Symmetry: D2
């Protein structure tokens, strides 16, 4: 069997504006039953208590389930819904719809490698596990599972790994206590452990070097981790390439070197299959289907030898995404770009992945 993945980027005027999204299926353009991921940007704060984000999640699930003719509960483990809140500046709220179907015959004429999607699920992550080696392990297992689901064995062909974990709630800690266990305290821990899990499963870090005392040098260049809610089941969404891919897309990745750097974005675009020096032409820009950039706050308050306010700013989270969005969009000309972050900090360095067209 050969995998055929597609991406459709549709706008949202509000967290609950599913008009264009529904039109995608109503028009016959996309089969709702083949949808494997929804990756969205919503308007709002982007903070841990952003209810708009949840609103978008709920709305998108309800729309998709309606289009499938199933009740909403069914979508439980069949689709990855990842909504990142906060869409400052040039970032246009949207949802990227990811489909994948498997076909008996490989189309001919497809150059090099092509996009493939894998998904994975963690064993329940108990509150006692959060930020600790148990989480690291369970995530690693899920990532390996996702690599297998995508039919990928070379980790250098894995270009983006999104992990959704749980965070510590008061009900969670109460549960831990009620079973005589302790907790690390929250979201910062879950995220770090998750990132480390990715690093382990992709061989970027040796498992021997992991311990609860060293969790919070050891990095993944392609991890995009987030945490929240009470759901103990973690989830992995993996985007890679393979020679067996029937997709008309290819993914690449890069590392943004500092807060003002465009080269990481460019590298993502270029390694995905677009050939250019400095700028993209309109046509080349249009070949870029989606960019997934995580713009976490920098490691320091020094930028090109000068002091910046980016760590001191009460609005740091918002500002970081604003800057990232400005950069990405200035290159691609496409406001509907997936700009996540600015939680906390390759030192100084942020991941960015690009999905571009791969034509026969």
């Amino acid at each position: 069997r050969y995998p055929k993945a597609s991406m459709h980027v549709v706008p949202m005027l509000a967290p609950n504006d599913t008009a264009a999204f529904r039109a995608l299926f109503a028009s016959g353009a996309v089969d709702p039953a083949s949808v494997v991921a929804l990756i969205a940007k919503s308007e709002g704060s982007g903070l841990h208590n952003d209810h708009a984000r949840v609103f978008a999640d709920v709305s998108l699930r309800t729309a998709l389930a309606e289009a499938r003719g199933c009740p909403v509960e069914d979508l439980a483990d069949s689709v990855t819904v990842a909504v990142s809140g906060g869409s400052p500046g040039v970032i246009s709220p949207h949802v990227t719809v990811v489909t994948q179907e498997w076909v008996a015959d490989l189309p001919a004429g497809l150059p090099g490698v092509g996009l493939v999607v894998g998904r994975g699920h963690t064993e329940p992550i108990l509150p006692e596990d959060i930020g600790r080696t148990a989480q690291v392990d369970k995530v690693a297992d899920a990532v390996a599972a996702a690599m297998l689901d995508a039919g990928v064995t070379d980790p250098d062909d894995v270009h983006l790994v999104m992990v959704k974990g749980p965070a510590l709630s008061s009900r969670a800690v109460a549960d831990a206590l009620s079973r005589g266990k302790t907790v690390v305290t929250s979201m910062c821990w879950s995220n770090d452990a998750s990132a480390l899990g990715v690093a382990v499963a992709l061989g970027e870090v040796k498992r021997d070097l992991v311990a609860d005392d060293r969790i919070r040098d050891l990095f993944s260049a392609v991890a995009a981790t987030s945490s929240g809610g009470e759901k103990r089941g973690g989830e992995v969404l993996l985007l890679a390439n393979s020679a067996q891919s029937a997709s008309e897309l290819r993914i690449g990745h890069g590392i943004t070197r500092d807060m003002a750097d465009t080269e990481g974005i460019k590298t993502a675009i270029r390694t995905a299959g677009v050939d250019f020096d400095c700028c993209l032409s309109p046509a080349q820009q249009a070949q870029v289907v989606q960019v997934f950039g995580k713009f976490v706050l920098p490691g320091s308050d020094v930028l090109r030898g000068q002091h910046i306010t980016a760590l001191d700013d009460h609005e740091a989270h918002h500002v970081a995404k604003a800057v990232g969005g400005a950069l990405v969009v200035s290159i691609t000309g496409q406001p509907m770009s997936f700009i996540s972050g600015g939680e906390r900090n390759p030192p100084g360095g942020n991941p960015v992945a690009a999905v571009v067209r791969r034509l026969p």
Copy 2:
């Protein structure tokens, strides 16, 4: 009487960090008596009640007067102090020190036109004038006066005009901008009633005296700098910045080389909120956002700095308005 203008960009770790600024003069590198403008970015909100901004203003004046050996009151109309609050993201707080002296003796091999600075003062602007034609007129007079002070007569050689007006705010700014338009012939005076590509207007305080700071070019310039300008087409556009850089004298297609980047001394970009919430055919949140003022500057700073690689860039704006934002660049000549 050739004019020789220079710019020295020095960092500030805080609104009252005048260390590097003082070192500029203490080292003999710059003559404090030749300082004609201070143009700074401070950390803070950028809003009308930003006291950090005022803190930077007060601190800078006190430092400069100390370096001059005069008391602070004397600087009253000899130096233009313009502090724009709010330095989000990649913008590094700083002060651009602008000097100008006249020299008897025009030095040989300077290509084309060169940077010149002019300054002007309005008649008192009465509260009854704010946002009305009287303001428009008084500002226009001050701009003409500034053009004369710089020894410039061709308005196509004027590349930046900063106006500082009083408040009782959006009105004062609009009237001031119109004043600039009138004085540069961009708009006919007849078309003005109570019912510019290069204006950078701001207002605040009770001070009835408006102030103009004008940056232009002239053939008679002994300056080792040149200024250019551009128009930012929408919120995601880098072409206006590039045009500013290019027309100032840097020859490039798409990107600058490290050397070329280093040839850019300062950028003065005003990033007012867009005219609409549509950008490249898509909805954006930029007008709805409670932090719009901050975000606009963040975006502008990201753009400018991504091109020049210099965090100490003068990114102002955040005020309210489908596009069209002024940017000036000062480069080596």
Copy 3:
């Protein structure tokens, strides 16, 4: 036809937490078909683009229609859903569920006047009407209609009037233009408030000119305005009574106290725990003050970028300090120095 109004205040841990709300009906405690108003506080910004607020609105409707066995579209003109965003400080997010049944025996036991609820609907308010006398008039009609629905004729027995109006969109302005008409949120609110004043005789239709009891808000494109009115009447079978007061300045508790007292609680300065518990709900609108002078001193309340949030924080602190109940309906934050506050207490 004797009216029996009740209020059930239930917590929400998030805009879409309808657990306690659903349990209200599932337990048999409240009949969902008798629900006439949902009045909620949600977590969020309280600003014009607060989607959490909308999230709560949608969630509440979807929960009430479920408990009614209808689909959600029906709740159409039958229930007033009013969600005020922004719950800073001591304000606990919640929904006050307002039921009203008509019935047969007037009990006795039941001293003086009692709570009654009236509802009303405006003629479509066209964009050309917003902020103008047409709106004033249509709102006035809707308020009169609501007074009638409640069986009240004396406007001195009306103690709270909530108006939901439309605001000006682009699509609205485009509409006005396409028919050659000229348009004038702040506007819609003022006109609505003036409507209430007219209908209650506080201001003479042929003219400093406030309503002491109006609580107005505007938003969306829906041309149909809505009135929710809370009053008293001698014909009321309710175990509750409503009163109102005016908050004199930003630091004043006397308006809250007056609301409580005139609703039927007898106290001088403080309430006892028991008296506190007699207070079922407080509806206070804490709009920004008229000036930046307070007890002879300068305050930052008008300059503050977070003014809207801070005003509610202050109001919530005041109300809750008196009643000891975090689940209090504290709205406002808009720009204007006297604020309305109403209290609903046990009759008993």
Copy 4:
């Protein structure tokens, strides 16, 4: 010698508005040379990078020094300048000017105990000390020194202890590393400082202190500590307000504990124990007897209030909101917007002190 302390509360329309402040001295009403503390509220964010706060600090010092006829550097260790940023809602920015002179003879007719002010200085607090027992100890020493400076030996007569400590700067950590020491910021310094106060006042036994329980064992606290930290200055500072029988002051201080975020009883207890006799409300006259309130409104320990969920810990504007609430409470009782409402940092009981008039018979 008998101490005579006074307090003059004057408004500020901006961080650098020293008009009313200067008029205080120019009018002869107050002797600038007797000023021992400036305690101010400024407009601004209240956050760690609030430059308006610093602006107020600088402005006040410059004004005071000008009034003294000395240069500003001299005020170095003679005056405690404590500016708390962020004045939301009903809080009117202002500066409370604290004077103290010593007199040979005690005026007669002064009932009970009276206000006295003490000041103290820590040994340099090294970055390796921040949040650790070394800080706890150095602060304790400084508080004992302040108690002695005020002529007070009974810790039950100490009603407010303001500690200004250092915080961990990026250059501080570099220094620590450069000397082979470890570190761990502002929350730590504050906790350690608070513990220092608790130790020096006998509220907590020294034996019970350890680096592993400073932040952990929340049982250990001081009912009267008001701690803050910031800057690079290694020298901590204590400002202590107490009572004594030897006081010639026409004021008396009291304190209370705010039980939860919605509680007025702590404020009331402060007022009452300071010398105002009332049950529930104050009369206008009684209100006017209250000269200043110093309340620290740090965020609550939990998000449960009177059995319900509140947003106060989740809110991105928590720091601001906490002070808005506190200010509402204080001002609702005293009717005086110029009240010293600090806090906003993190943790469910908050200290509040009140200074009222104590008139001769």
